[PDB]
Amino acid sequence: EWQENKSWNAHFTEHKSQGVVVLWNENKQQGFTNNLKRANQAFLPASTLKIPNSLIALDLGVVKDEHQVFKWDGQTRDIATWNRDHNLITAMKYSVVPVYQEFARQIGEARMSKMLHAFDYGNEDISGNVDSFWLDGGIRISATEQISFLRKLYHNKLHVSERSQRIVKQAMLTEANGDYIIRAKTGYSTRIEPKIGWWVGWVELDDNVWFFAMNMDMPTSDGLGLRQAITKEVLKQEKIIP
Amino acid sequence: EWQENKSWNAHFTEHKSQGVVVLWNENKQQGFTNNLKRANQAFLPASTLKIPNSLIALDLGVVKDEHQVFKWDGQTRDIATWNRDHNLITAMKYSVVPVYQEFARQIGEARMSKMLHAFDYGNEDISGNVDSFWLDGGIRISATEQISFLRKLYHNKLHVSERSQRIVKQAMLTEANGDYIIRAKTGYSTRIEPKIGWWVGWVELDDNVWFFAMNMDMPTSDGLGLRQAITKEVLKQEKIIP
Ligand SMILES: [Cl-]
């Protein structure tokens, strides 16, 4: 059963923002959120789509492994970290659109769409075009749908090989210490109103896993750090992390 | 190739300690240590043996996956984290000897030596006999030999399945942040003099990986934190980590 907890709103209020955090306790099969309505609002995935994109690239052998280097094409771009060679680990880490655009062109439009459908990943909206779709059809996904997808990935239940899912979860590694491990992917949807920032993944504990998906209004990039900040604030409140 | 950097001795000296740090630059295929003689001294591996032990258990089906629970046997031991159910992840995190003894029980001495020999992990295995011979399956291994075995694991070149090696590499996840990822295993050999503490593994960077292996005289359990602290001071000094 889903349970709503407005007390989390204070963490959004504090930084003068608007959003939703969704948490799923895997042991208890119970969800929590500050807003069930927006928890179920579908938005563009932005770079959270790189999780299934990576699964598909690995499963088709377009990416051999997390070590294969994809060379910089020489065009310089506004994100300095993109102007360098990358492997799957660092392409995830820095959300390198040109690397993923080259994956997408090797995979194929139609296969991409089919294989995202096989994931139950958001809802139809299939164009376009090749490799960056939305415009006459952009997959949208709600935060709870992100949890549902992430749960299958965690349990290796998706319609791709087990190796593919293992390597993507390695590449999603964001933080680890003696208390918790976070595997997650950020996203920032700018090219259609309303601008929103994403953070989706899970926290592994010794004896439990907490899946989370959050999105929030992001009129400018000044607030991007708040994606992790507000999430951790909520994770601290619910005593998931210290 | 193998440079001796005696300026690292200051990091043991600082703590009135005695030991060796070994580093391997994977990109440059070049190694560094403060003591070439100690770097090649074979010690009992203690809990660093749990890295190859885990590979063997997975490859044989003794451990089905990283989620299989291994129930506590009801006998309380001195270390509180041992007195609970464990899976592969938490067993390695707290170095739970009763769990690994049950792995060894199912593997048997004979297969353990065949496989350790196939890994070229240290020297002697089952044939270990006479004088002090019952410990750590008769293995003695040096810090440079730890590096050799870790490099094979990193590259999935050991003679067990790729899946086995990927699962074990997940299980050694110790620390991760925006600057690096450490995969490693501690060890503390106490049943034979001189007592020594181990820390072995590697540091993943965007663009390189640095393998490390350190051991150090450890009279009392008081100074086990020095294993990581001295290592990190070498890593900081060499500008591997901030
Ligand atoms: Cl990992």
Author numbering:
A (entry chain A), B (entry chain B): 24 to 265
Copy out sentences from the published article reporting this entry, exactly as the authors wrote them.
OXA-48 confers resistance to many carbapenem and penicillin β-lactams, but only slowly hydrolyses oxyimino-cephalosporins such as ceftazidime (CAZ). Low catalytic activity for CAZ hydrolysis has been attributed to the substrate’s bulkiness, potentially requiring sampling of alternative loop conformations to promote cephalosporin binding and hydrolysis. Here we reveal how directed evolution of a β-lactamase yielded highly epistatic activity enhancements. We describe how distinct mutations shifted the rate-limiting step from substrate binding to the chemical reaction in the β-lactamase OXA-48, thereby causing strong phenotypic epistasis.
In wtOXA-48, F72 is embedded within an aromatic pocket formed by Y144, F156, and W157, in close proximity to the active site S70. The F72L mutation disturbs this aromatic network, which probably reduces the thermostability and allows the Ω loop harbouring F156 and W157 to adapt a different conformation. Except for F72L, which reduced the Tm by 6 °C, the selected mutations barely affected the thermostability. F72L increased the IC50 by twofold, followed by a fivefold gain in IC50 through S212A. Introduction of F72L led to saturation kinetics and substantially decreased the KM to 165 ± 15 µM, suggesting an improvement in substrate binding. To estimate how the conformational dynamics changed during evolution, we performed ensemble refinements based on the crystal structures of wtOXA-48, F72L and Q5. Despite their differences in resolution, both F72L and Q5 revealed an increased flexibility primarily resulting in the Ω loop adopting various alternate conformations. Notably, F72L allows the protein to populate a different conformational ensemble, in which the space created by the loss of the phenylalanine sidechain allows the neighbouring α-helix to slide toward the centre of the protein while increasing the conformational freedom of the Ω loop. This movement is accompanied by a tightening of an H-bonding network below the Ω loop involving T71, Y144 and Q169. F72L primarily decreased the dynamical correlation between S70 and the Ω loop, which agrees with the increased flexibility and improved substrate binding conferred by F72L.
